[PDB]
């Protein structure tokens, strides 16, 4: 569905202050900590048992940076999300066999991370806008 111009402006303004080098790593670490079965796909990233080990893993931080770059790319093309995420969806579906629900889990974890870093600035309206954003990202990245 189309996103309203006010929601687009709020999303872009909130994403402008997002630390690209750290927010994605935070989201990926929180995903691997809260949902431990997501650590199955990152068995090559080293120690992933302790939550401190997951959050402090340099490979997890780098992959979170890449994930957040992909989110930024999908944000720049919010209206054409299937096209920009077609290759990533194919990669996750075939080479990695990542369940589509893991994308929604990572989206919700990212929403929680954004709320955590932005405090009261993450108002219910901008949260709804980002929920639409992450739902679109997960749908475009699935099947």
């Amino acid at each position: 569905v189309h996103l309203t111009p006010e929601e687009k402006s709020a999303v872009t303004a909130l994403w402008g202050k997002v630390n690209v080098d750290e927010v994605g790593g935070e989201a990926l670490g929180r995903l691997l900590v809260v949902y431990p079965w997501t650590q199955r796909f990152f068995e090559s990233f080293g120690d992933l048992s302790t939550p401190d080990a997951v959050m402090g893993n340099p490979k997890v931080k780098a992959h979170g940076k890449k994930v957040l770059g992909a989110f930024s790319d999908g944000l720049a093309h919010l209206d054409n999300l299937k096209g920009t995420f077609a290759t990533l969806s194919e990669l996750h579906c075939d080479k990695l066999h990542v369940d589509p629900e893991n994308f929604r889990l990572l989206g919700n974890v990212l929403v929680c991370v954004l709320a955590h870093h932005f405090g009261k600035e993450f108002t219910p309206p901008v949260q709804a806008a980002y929920q639409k954003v992450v739902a679109g990202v997960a749908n475009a990245l699935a099947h």
């Binding site: 189309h2 720049a76 093309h77 919010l78 209206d79 054409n80 299937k82 096209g83 920009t84 077609a86 290759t87 194919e90 099947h143």
Partner: protein, 440 residues
């Protein structure tokens, strides 16, 4: 043994067809289980037929007949022969003859590219030929690099490459290519990374196109706004009319359009209608670009046609080239207003003499004072009284540093807000009123 002759049967030529290996004096086929591009590349290098174009496992080449030698193979790509991977046993399988795997190699491939249903020979709905069959391309992942690669492969002026089929309708048949990923240096379109041939998750509505041009036939202007630099964005590409859709269209591309027309920056995405304009089937969709570019064609990945701007609206643009004294009747006279606690406040005229007037006039730089008016001479102020009894000696440069009763400590009302008339205050009525005296 090391004497296993391998042949391809019923696939047009020697390099394309269903795999068939001769072992133990009998010819046997190969299963399609866990069959990917690595196994196809191994097969192609076995026959010295080059790279692996694709693979087929649905027995499209034809039903086989014989002992299927291989069922499951774990090939990383670099093998001296097909009989080197983890073939999980020889002859053992769980297939039937309907699961036999084919392969199409580069040397025997008849791959070709063409453009159909376009304004010129360098634009339209791109199509590719696979297994002698012409099919279209889905537009997912189809970026400007893919457009440039296709333009170079076809061969015609490719200075400006634009995605999006020009006025082209949906194709027919198969979608042989999808999610093309080119870095812009591949000699052809099939050397790029993409999905398996035939396998896709699109429909014919999303048929990818291309617009190869040298940049001399791309024109843009604003129509319907009367002036040259206000109105909807009309697009002329290869003598074809068009209008810009507002999907992914902010102010950043609007100022790019304005700069291209040469009318400063962009003000708003709206205009006052002057005349009616026609509606064109094709549209210009702008994904995103930085906004500092000197022209609209010069920023990355702008789609020209190929989609319907029905859910969205036409893109409009209108370029840039389409302490204090209050209520005193002057500058150095009026109610003495002080600021405190984020609110403007007044000073009660209790024991307000000419010393306080001198202090407040010199603090404001208005020289000395002529009068110390009371009883709200310049109107009653609207703000809590801060100072009540001013005991300034007439020499200090600030009013708040005097012997007052403290901020908020008062027993007065706003009906007696203190006011002063400094010497520098001037009034005109010919008579001029300076230094508290009227004169010619």
């Amino acid at each position: 043994g090391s004497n296993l002759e391998m042949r391809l049967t019923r696939g047009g030529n020697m390099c394309s067809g269903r795999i068939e290996i001769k072992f133990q004096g009998r010819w046997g086929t190969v299963c399609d289980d866990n069959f990917n591009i690595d196994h196809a590349s191994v097969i192609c290098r076995q026959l010295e037929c080059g790279s692996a174009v694709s693979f087929s496992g649905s027995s499209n080449f034809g039903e086989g007949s014989g002992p299927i030698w291989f069922d499951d193979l774990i090939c990383n790509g670099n093998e001296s022969a097909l009989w080197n991977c983890k073939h999980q046993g020889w002859g053992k399988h769980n297939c039937d003859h309907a699961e036999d795997a084919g392969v199409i190699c580069s040397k025997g491939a008849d791959l070709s590219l063409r453009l159909v249903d376009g304004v010129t020979e360098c634009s339209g709905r791109l199509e590719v030929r696979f297994q002698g069959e012409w099919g279209t391309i889905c537009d997912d992942g189809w970026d400007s690099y893919d457009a440039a690669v296709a333009c170079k492969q076809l061969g015609c002026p490719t200075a400006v490459t634009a995605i999006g089929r020009v006025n082209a309708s949906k194709g027919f048949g198969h979608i042989w290519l999808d999610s093309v990923s080119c870095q812009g240096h591949e000699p052809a379109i099939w050397q790029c990374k993409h999905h398996e041939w035939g396998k896709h998750y699109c429909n014919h509505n999303e048929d990818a196109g291309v617009t190869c041009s040298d940049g001399s036939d791309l024109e843009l202007r604003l129509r319907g706004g009367g002036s040259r630099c206000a109105g909807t964005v009309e697009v002329e590409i290869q003598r074809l009319l068009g209008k810009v859709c507002d999907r992914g269209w902010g102010l950043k591309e609007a100022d790019v359009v304005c700069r291209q027309l040469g009318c400063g920056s962009a003000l708003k995405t709206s205009y006052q209608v002057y005349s009616k304009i026609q509606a064109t089937n094709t549209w210009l969709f702008l994904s995103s670009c930085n906004g500092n570019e000197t022209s609209l064609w010069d920023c990355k990945n702008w789609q020209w046609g190929g989609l319907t701007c029905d859910h969205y609206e036409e893109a409009k643009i209108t370029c840039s080239a389409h302490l204090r004294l209050v209520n005193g009747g002057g500058r150095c006279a009026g109610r003495v207003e002080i600021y405190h606690e984020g609110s403007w406040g007044t000073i009660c005229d209790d024991s307000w003499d000419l010393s306080d007037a001198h202090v407040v006039c010199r603090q404001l730089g208005c020289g000395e004072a002529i009068n110390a008016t009371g009883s709200a001479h310049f109107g009653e102020g609207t703000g809590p009284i801060w100072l009540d009894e001013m005991k300034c000696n007439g020499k200090e440069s600030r009013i708040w540093q005097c012997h007052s009763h403290g901020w908020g400590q008062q027993n007065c009302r706003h009906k007696e807000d203190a006011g002063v008339i400094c010497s520098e205050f001037m009034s005109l009525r010919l008579e001029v009123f300076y230094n508290g005296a009227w004169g010619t």
